């Protein structure tokens, strides 16, 4: 009643089974690679029923050394990962194996990683601010407790640094459980995060699930599901607040696109799989808070080639309560975090939730920055001296505001040597209200670069020869 390998091509394997023994879709099957150097047990996820008792599956491990006609065993169930309080403080791979303690968690309860999202009637909008201490995020892109937050950006703009910063600020003093999902990212970053959480003492409250960019596409497709399964167990069974971190969720889509053409699917626009939106919707709709059960999810979304019109980030945008969009231009200007204040958004940035003062100050900041962006080309060509006096005033105010939106972060010290800082929301609102009124116009713009609150501004201005 066992199958046999028929065709092998990269990570996709065709397996033939006897009559009435075709495994159900998404079932996990096992095959043996007996070559000494590469000896292992391949886990294959059934992806398609091709007919004639054939099934197409995605290998979770590299298929090098696999032989045609080797026995394939059906486990009768999808990939399942351990769940329970025991997963906290341990590192797992997409298949639920414990990396830091092999054999650990084999006796725990196991949950299938394929699951339907919460019923619509169980869904509840979340409109509670989650203060972070970062000026730009707290002012222009306020995060939502129990909501979906994303950090969009191109390669090397600070998505991972900001993820670590939010782990430092939010997860350190978090009552509940944390789940981190490394999805198709650097193994070095995973090790660094593991060590950092161990040293910060946050590891005991955190479950880490790593599928790295060196893994085959199937592992990068399923690691997010595994981590989300652990988080879903914590939300639905233990009934405690959950922090979920994913970096990078785009790798799920990328691996799907990598295997799509080998699965026989005609490519869609921009080389993506035709099922991009549907798969992303399933995965994202599983990542949510239900009524009375809170999951605060923060996702790093890679924007290919800095192109925000790319179908992957464009489809992802619809799934977020708050989005902080990092810009290559801001990065290259030396502004950190490289947040684009005009492109980022938050659903709770309205007077009803954040209050009239916060909303008004944020809107004024956005208006000033938009006008400055409009005037940048004119300044570049004809110079500032050809602007109206009011426009000169606005340009100075906007430069100071854009510099002040930058901040020295706790996770950024390793890159600058400067210790990080935290700014309360009230101080941020007051400082930007003062800035938008031109109360700091007399200070040099350099005094506003990479600092915290108004006390830091005064100290730096004094160091630069000016009095606040």
């Amino acid at each position: 009643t066992a199958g046999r390998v028929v065709r092998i091509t990269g990570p996709v394997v065709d397996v033939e089974f006897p009559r009435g023994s075709v495994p159900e879709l998404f079932n996990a099957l096992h095959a043996e690679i007996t070559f000494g150097a590469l000896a292992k047990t391949l886990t294959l996820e059934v992806a398609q029923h091709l007919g004639d008792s054939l099934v197409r599956c995605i290998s979770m491990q590299p298929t090098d050394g696999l032989v045609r006609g080797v026995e394939v065993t059906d486990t009768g169930a999808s990939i399942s990962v351990p769940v329970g309080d025991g997963v906290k403080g341990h590192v797992f791979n997409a298949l639920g194996d414990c990396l830091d303690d092999p054999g650990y968690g084999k006796d725990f309860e196991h949950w299938s990683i394929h699951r339907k999202p919460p019923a619509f009637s169980d869904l509840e909008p979340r409109t509670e601010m989650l203060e972070t201490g970062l000026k730009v995020v707290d002012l222009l892109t306020p995060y939502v407790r129990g909501g979906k937050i994303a950090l969009f950006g191109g390669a090397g703009v600070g998505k991972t640094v900001l993820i670590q910063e939010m782990i430092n600020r939010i997860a350190r003093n978090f009552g509940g459980t944390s789940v981190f999902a490394g999805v198709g990212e650097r193994t070095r970053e995973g090790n660094d995060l593991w060590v950092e959480l161990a040293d910060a003492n946050v590891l005991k409250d955190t479950a880490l699930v790593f599928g790295q960019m060196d893994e085959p596409p199937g592992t990068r497709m399923r690691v997010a599901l595994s981590a989300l399964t652990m988080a879903e167990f914590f939300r639905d069974e233990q009934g405690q607040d959950v922090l979920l971190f994913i970096d990078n969720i785009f790798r799920f889509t990328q691996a799907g696109s990598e295997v799509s053409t080998l699965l026989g699917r005609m490519p869609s626009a921009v080389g993506y799989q035709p099922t991009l939106a549907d798969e992303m919707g399933e995965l994202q709709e599983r990542i949510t808070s239900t009524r009375g059960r809170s999951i605060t999810s923060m996702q790093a979304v890679y924007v290919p080639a800095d192109d925000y019109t790319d179908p992957a980030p464009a489809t992802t945008f619809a799934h977020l309560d708050a989005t902080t969009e990092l810009s290559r231009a801001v990065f290259s200007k030396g502004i950190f975090p490289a947040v684009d204040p005009l492109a980022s958004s938050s659903t709770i940035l309205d007077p009803a939730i954040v209050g009239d003062e916060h909303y008004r100050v944020a809107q004024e900041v956005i208006r000033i920055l938009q006008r400055y962006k409009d005037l940048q080309d004119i300044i570049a060509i004809l110079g500032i001296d050809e602007l109206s006096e009011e426009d000169k005033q606005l340009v100075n105010r906007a430069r100071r505001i854009e510099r002040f939106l930058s901040q020295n972060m706790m996770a950024a010290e390793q890159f600058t040597g400067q210790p990080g800082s935290t700014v309360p929301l009230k101080e941020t609102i007051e400082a930007f209200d003062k800035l938008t009124k031109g109360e700091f116009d007399h200070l040099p713009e350099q005094a506003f670069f990479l600092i915290g609150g108004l006390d830091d501004l005064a100290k730096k201005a004094e160091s630069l020869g000016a009095k606040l």
């Binding site: 053409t261 026989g264 699917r265 005609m266 490519p267 869609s268 626009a269 921009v270 080389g271």
Partner: protein, 48 residues
């Protein structure tokens, strides 16, 4: 008077630059559509 003449010249040059950039942008738009169709049809033919 010299400023008026120079600004008229600058406006004419800006109009010419806008025209040239629009032509180049339309060429790029058409080329992008053609290349995207080429990739899509190549994939479809390969899976044919």
């Amino acid at each position: 008077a010299s400023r008026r003449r120079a600004m008229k010249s600058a406006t004419d040059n800006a109009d010419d630059l806008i025209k040239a950039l629009t032509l180049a942008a339309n060429r790029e738009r058409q080329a992008q559509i053609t290349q995207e169709i080429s990739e899509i049809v190549g994939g479809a033919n390969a899976l044919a």
